[PDB]
Write an enzyme that holds these catalytic residues in place. Sequence first.
Site, short mmCIF file in Angstrom:
data_model
loop_
_atom_site.label_atom_id
_atom_site.label_comp_id
_atom_site.label_asym_id
_atom_site.label_seq_id
_atom_site.Cartn_x
_atom_site.Cartn_y
_atom_site.Cartn_z
N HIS A 287 4.92 -10.13 10.35
CA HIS A 287 5.21 -9.94 8.97
C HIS A 287 4.98 -11.22 8.20
O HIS A 287 5.16 -12.31 8.72
CB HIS A 287 6.66 -9.49 8.77
CG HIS A 287 6.89 -8.06 9.12
ND1 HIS A 287 8.05 -7.63 9.71
CD2 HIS A 287 6.09 -6.97 8.98
CE1 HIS A 287 7.98 -6.32 9.91
NE2 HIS A 287 6.80 -5.89 9.48
N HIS B 254 -0.16 -4.95 12.82
CA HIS B 254 0.68 -5.20 13.96
C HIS B 254 -0.07 -4.87 15.23
O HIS B 254 -0.08 -5.66 16.16
CB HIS B 254 1.97 -4.40 13.91
CG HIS B 254 2.92 -4.88 12.87
ND1 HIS B 254 3.27 -6.20 12.73
CD2 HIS B 254 3.59 -4.21 11.91
CE1 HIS B 254 4.19 -6.32 11.80
NE2 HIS B 254 4.36 -5.14 11.24
N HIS C 9 -0.90 -1.52 7.14
CA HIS C 9 0.12 -2.50 7.53
C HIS C 9 0.34 -2.40 9.01
O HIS C 9 0.37 -3.43 9.74
CB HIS C 9 1.44 -2.29 6.78
CG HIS C 9 2.60 -3.09 7.31
ND1 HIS C 9 3.08 -4.22 6.67
CD2 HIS C 9 3.38 -2.93 8.40
CE1 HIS C 9 4.11 -4.71 7.34
NE2 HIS C 9 4.32 -3.94 8.39
N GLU C 10 0.57 -1.18 9.49
CA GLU C 10 0.93 -1.04 10.87
C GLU C 10 -0.24 -1.44 11.77
O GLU C 10 -0.01 -1.92 12.88
CB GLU C 10 1.42 0.38 11.20
CG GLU C 10 2.69 0.78 10.45
CD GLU C 10 3.88 -0.16 10.63
OE1 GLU C 10 4.81 -0.06 9.78
OE2 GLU C 10 3.93 -0.92 11.62
#
Lengths: 159, 182
Positions: A123, A117, A113-114
């Site tokens: 998101h 980014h 997930h990170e």
Amino acid sequence: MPKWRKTHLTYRIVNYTPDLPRDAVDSAIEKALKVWEEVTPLTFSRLYEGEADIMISFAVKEHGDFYSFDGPGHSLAHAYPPGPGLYGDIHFDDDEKWTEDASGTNLFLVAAHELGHSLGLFHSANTEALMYPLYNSFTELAQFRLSQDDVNGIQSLYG
Amino acid sequence: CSCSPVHPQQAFCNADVVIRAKAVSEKEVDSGNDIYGNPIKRIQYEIKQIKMFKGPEKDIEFIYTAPSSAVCGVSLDVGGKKEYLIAGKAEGDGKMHITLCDFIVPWDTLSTTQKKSLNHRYQMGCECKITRCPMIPCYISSPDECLWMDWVTEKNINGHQAKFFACIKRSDGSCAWYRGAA
Ligand SMILES: [Ca+2]
Ligand SMILES: [Ca+2]
Ligand SMILES: [Ca+2]
Ligand SMILES: [Zn+2]
Ligand SMILES: [Zn+2]
């Protein structure tokens, strides 16, 4: 930058959580990268010293960035969009118990997930998307899958 | 940013400051810095503190958060007459910061029992552990611990236990859910 202006990116695992042997941290992050390598023309290479694009580390409470961690639970990690220095970097909250399985906070799922980014993603409001901030794809690891929403996002940046 | 959900009691017990507030204005500021040239921006909300349930004698006037959700930045509805219950961290006189993972809800969404719990009941239970159950079946490890079942039973973080229950220590050493009083 909403995106990195190159194809070949570097990362380095700067420090290591007590909750896991170094080899297990290494492997979880390698898999998390893979997730994004499989659907883009990006390739990552590991650096063991100096400054990589994506500096990955473990920290607790204040750790020099104005975004203090907050103890057990709550925020598990955070990351910075593409850019120089701190940008692109990933910090994990070591007040979590990082695990390889789903017994604690799963490092691979969070790291994936990170990394999104770090690559430019925001998101998603889709609760089956990896980029949904609340456990993203709740349990299934040996059959975890990017959602098509995640793939669209990342391929919109890098083809 | 990756969050794990929080029952209001957990939020309340973990947070330095818990207030009812309205955000009046928004703007970027530079508070840093960074060890190479490049600076870290934060959103500064100007707020009016309507009421404090926990935190310092000097009223909060500003709340900070990150500009992007990647670093757990949160949007408050500014101007827009929107009241919030905000649980977060003190950051020197009249300042606090919040994140996406903080307990932050419009005042008007709270149940009556949640609101009343802010006086005392949540504080009474800080010694108790609240553990989210990932899937049925799940078991307490220790006697001073309640199992948070909202997700598992309701698929809803603001479920039944969130709305109506506190996890309180029970003379003897066991903790248990209570729907309460006051
Ligand atoms: Ca970087
Ligand atoms: Ca945390
Ligand atoms: Ca840890
Ligand atoms: Zn950080
Ligand atoms: Zn995130």
